[PDB]
From a paper:
The crystal structure of CspAcXE was solved in the native state (1.30 Å). The sequence identity between the CspAcXE and PbeAcXE is 52.4%. Both comprise an N-terminal CBM-like domain consisting of three antiparallel β-sheets, and a C-terminal SGNH domain where the central β-sheet comprises five parallel β-strands flanked on both sides with α-helices. In both cases, the CBM-like and catalytic SGNH domains are tightly packed and connected through a loop of six to seven amino acids. The residues forming the CBM-like domains in PbeAcXE and CspAcXE are 1–175 and 1–176, respectively, whereas residues forming the SGNH domain in PbeAcXE and CspAcXE are 180–385 and 181–386, respectively. The first seven N-terminal residues of PbeAcXE and the first 10 residues of CspAcXE did not have electron density and so were not included in the final structures. Moreover, residues 350 to 365 in CspAcXE, which form a loop next to the active site, had unclear or missing electron density and so were omitted from the solved structure; this could be the result of the absence of ligand to stabilize its conformation, or due to the absence of many crystal packing contacts in this region of the protein. The Ser-Asp-His catalytic triad is formed by Ser188, Asp363, and His366 in PbeAcXE, and Ser189, Asp363, and His366 in CspAcXE. In CspAcXE, these residues are Ser189, Gly229 and Asn266. Therefore, like the GDSL-hydrolases, the GNSI-AcXEs do not have the nucleophilic elbow; this is corroborated by the crystal structures of PbeAcXE and CspAcXE, which show that the Asn in this motif (Asn187 and Asn188) are buried into the interior of the enzymes.
Acetyl xylan esterases (AcXE) that target mono- or doubly acetylated Xylp are well characterized; however, the previously studied AcXE from Flavobacterium johnsoniae (FjoAcXE) was the first to remove the acetyl group from 2-O-MeGlcpA-3-O-acetyl-substituted Xylp units, yet structural characteristics of these enzymes remain unspecified. All homologs were confirmed to release acetate from 2-O-MeGlcpA-3-O-acetyl-substituted xylan, and the crystal structures point to key structural elements that might serve as defining features of this unclassified carbohydrate esterase family. Enzymes comprised two domains: N-terminal CBM domain and a C-terminal SGNH domain. In FjoAcXE and all studied homologs, the sequence motif around the catalytic serine is Gly-Asn-Ser-Ile (GNSI), which differs from other SGNH hydrolases.
Numbering used by the authors: 11 to 349, 366 to 387
């Protein structure tokens, strides 16, 4: 069997305001819920400490099928091991995969990942915009069926990705983006970001049954410089080339590169740098056997449009995506729009993606 990454999130350094509420992670247990795409019977999970400056010390990890919110089906709970060990402690900047574990993972299903921490500092790697409630209880409760009075926090910590073993040809679509991809305005706990809607359509169609979708969106992200979280260029290798089975990359990013410009000259400079960055990413993906699909968008909100040079430059970017011939194909969301992000808009976007782009090889 070969590994395929079925779920991912893009890690970053957690800002102070996005650290969990009391009692905190230190010495406590955190239960987190994710939606997988392709299913299977043998799994492994990777945890990331990539952006922290302190060690990540974990006493135990389990996986289970959720029942309702913070509870799990007790008969499904399985412990992870790390080179046989219950626990791990990994250096600043490192990550770790669990050993393989037998686990019946249904496609398009929710998985509860429960982590019991040792000492945790204020320097933590995670994904704040989870769009999903996580649950904290005191002490070591990795295998507790029912969490009593858990503290709720709508953030993810430590997670990176889940891989499944496959026997049939199976491949992943990775999606690099900002908050439009990460799911701003999607429904909390609903797992209804546009990549989830697209993922469900792949799984419901026989010719794309073995195609997973990896959400590498980060809210506020920029491609070239600035923004929130590591830039797309800086996280490209770690997020896109570091998974299992990636065959396609969708790029939906760049608006924030222009949204922060304050004069027309800087807007022009950031537009040129963004177009150069697209080519660097296309070339890197091609070198690794990955096709790249460029996605257009119209900027959301009013703050982008209060200075007119921004939209005039953004129209040039959309035109380059459409007409430069550098992308292997184009997903023209902007044109479809013209025919604030929210759940209905993500349903529309997810239904628009052409499944025929995910069928060759
Ligand atoms: Cl969660
Ligand atoms: Cl994903
Ligand atoms: Cl954003």
């Amino acid at each position: 069997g070969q590994w395929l990454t079925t779920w991912a999130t893009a890690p970053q350094l957690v800002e102070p305001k996005n650290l969990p509420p009391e009692p905190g992670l230190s010495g406590n247990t955190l239960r987190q819920i994710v939606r997988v795409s392709v299913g299977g019977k043998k799994l492994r999970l990777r945890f990331s400490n990539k952006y922290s400056m302190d060690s990540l010390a974990v006493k135990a990890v389990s996986i289970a099928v959720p029942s309702d919110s913070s509870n799990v089906d007790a008969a499904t709970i399985r412990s992870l091991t790390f080179e046989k060990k219950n626990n791990f402690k990994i250096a600043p900047g490192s990550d770790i995969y669990s050993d393989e574990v037998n686990f019946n993972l249904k496609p398009n299903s929710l998985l509860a990942i429960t982590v019991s921490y040792a000492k945790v500092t204020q320097s933590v790697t995670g994904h704040p915009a989870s769009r999903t409630t996580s649950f904290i209880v005191k002490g070591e409760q990795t295998n507790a069926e029912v969490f009593k009075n858990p503290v709720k926090t709508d953030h993810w910590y430590s997670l990176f990705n889940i891989d499944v073993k496959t026997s049939e040809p199976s491949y992943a679509v990775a999606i690099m983006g900002n908050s439009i991809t990460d799911g701003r305005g999607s429904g909390t706990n609903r797992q209804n970001r546009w990549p989830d809607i697209f993922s469900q359509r792949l799984l419901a169609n026989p010719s794309t049954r073995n195609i997973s979708v990896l959400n590498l969106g980060i809210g506020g992200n920029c491609v070239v410089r600035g923004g929130l979280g590591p830039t797309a260029l800086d996280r490209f290798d770690y997020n896109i080339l570091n998974q299992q089975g990636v065959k396609w990359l969708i790029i939906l990013e760049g608006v924030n590169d222009l949204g922060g410009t304050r004069d027309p000259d800087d807007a022009s400079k950031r537009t040129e740098e963004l177009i150069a960055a697209y080519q660097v990413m296309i070339d890197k993906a091609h070198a690794n056997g990955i096709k790249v699909y460029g996605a257009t968008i119209l900027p959301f909100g009013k703050s982008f449009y209060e200075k007119p040079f921004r939209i005039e430059e953004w129209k040039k970017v959309n035109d380059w995506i459409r007409n430069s011939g550098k992308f292997d194909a184009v997903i023209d969301f902007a044109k479809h729009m013209q025919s604030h992000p929210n759940e209905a808009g993500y349903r529309r976007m997810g239904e628009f993606v052409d499944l025929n782009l995910f069928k060759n090889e």
